[PDB]
Amino acid sequence: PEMVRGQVFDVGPRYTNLSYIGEGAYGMVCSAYDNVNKVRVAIKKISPFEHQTYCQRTLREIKILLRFRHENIIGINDIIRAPTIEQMKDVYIVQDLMETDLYKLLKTQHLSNDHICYFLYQILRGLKYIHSANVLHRDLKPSNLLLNTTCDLKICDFGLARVADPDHDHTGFLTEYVATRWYRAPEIMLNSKGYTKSIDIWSVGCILAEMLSNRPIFPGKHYLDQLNHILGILGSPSQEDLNCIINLKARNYLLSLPHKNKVPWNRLFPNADSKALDLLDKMLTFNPHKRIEVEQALAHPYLEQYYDPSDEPIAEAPFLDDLPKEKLKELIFEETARFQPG
Ligand SMILES: COc1cc(F)cc([C@@H](CO)NC(=O)[C@@H](C)N2Cc3ccc(-c4nc(Nc5cnn(C)n5)ncc4Cl)cc3C2=O)c1
What we know:
The protein is α+β, with helices and mostly antiparallel strands. About 35% of the residues lie in helices and about 15% in strands. It is built from 12 helices and 12 strands. Strands 3-4-5-7-6 form a 5-stranded antiparallel sheet, with no helix packed on it. A 3-stranded antiparallel sheet has the order 8-10-11. Helix 1 runs parallel beside helix 12 and helix 3 packs antiparallel against helix 5. The two termini are about 25 Å apart. The structure holds ligand UOH. The ligand COc1cc(F)cc([C@@H](CO)NC(=O)[C@@H](C)N2Cc3ccc(-c4nc(Nc5cnn(C)n5)ncc4Cl)cc3C2=O)c1 binds next to strand 3, strand 5, helix 1 and strand 8. The site of ligand UOH has 25 residues, from strand 3, strand 5, helix 1 and strand 8. It is classed as signaling protein.
């Protein structure tokens, strides 16, 4: 087997001429030439079976990506694993190869307003599909937005996704860790389990702000800092919004804060398009019930050059994993069976 920076990649005979792309807690990702379709693909080696949480992310991603088909959502083209459960130690997920991600891109490149507009369109177009399937991505962030050399955008990593469950969204104060901290909506820290579509809209708002300035808008240095950053810009919630928060610990925390005025978007983003800032405001609304929804956002004047509901497709139909890691391995085995010869 070919070796890539220490690891084996058991992907042959079909996939050859491997080259390192990246590493992380997920595993390792390479490009590789596909000897069938004669195109270079990405392959990620995932080794989840000792960790229930890794098994959950792997199963969720596989189940979701196999069902979804959309231009702005990364696919799974093939999955390589051992022929038996006993011999299966790794799962390789083969996906379309992309040049970079928005996190890498924002570290190095100034985006024109036209690029910002086009990227936000593709994010929302993809999200319209995801939400139309009653699915929440729940970890939207620049590193989960893949880009090719012509700036086509694809959402990736569906391992943290859930089916939407808005009647069971309420929880207590400083409970929850939904999303990656900088992209996590205020209600997560206050009273929300992140089981509504408005969680994803918040993250998109944070992405938009970051495209405007190449700097995260709410860079909390740790968990507790995150609400400080958000309220620092948005200001004190209104009486109406506060009254929606019935949990006393959360309400009284907010009431204990000194009055803070809203920092106007045009001062944080003096070079930004005024329409972009109007949409940004509506995505970064404190009250999730008042927050713009994905189809309204697509309809916003900022995106008028692209908006076309007939070309913004929805899923054909809507889409208990409190299970031990051994059971999750079986379900991963069954879910990947269709890519074996048989
Ligand atoms: C503890 O964490 C995890 C444990 C798990 F058991 C499983 C996971 C899974 C599911 O939750 N999560 C991921 O696999 C996420 C984290 N990533 C990483 C990743 C890297 C590259 C590409 C990629 N990259 C490119 N091109 C590219 C990138 N950079 N360059 C210069 N080129 N093309 C095509 C592709 Cl699929 C996609 C992804 C992706 O989805 C996480």
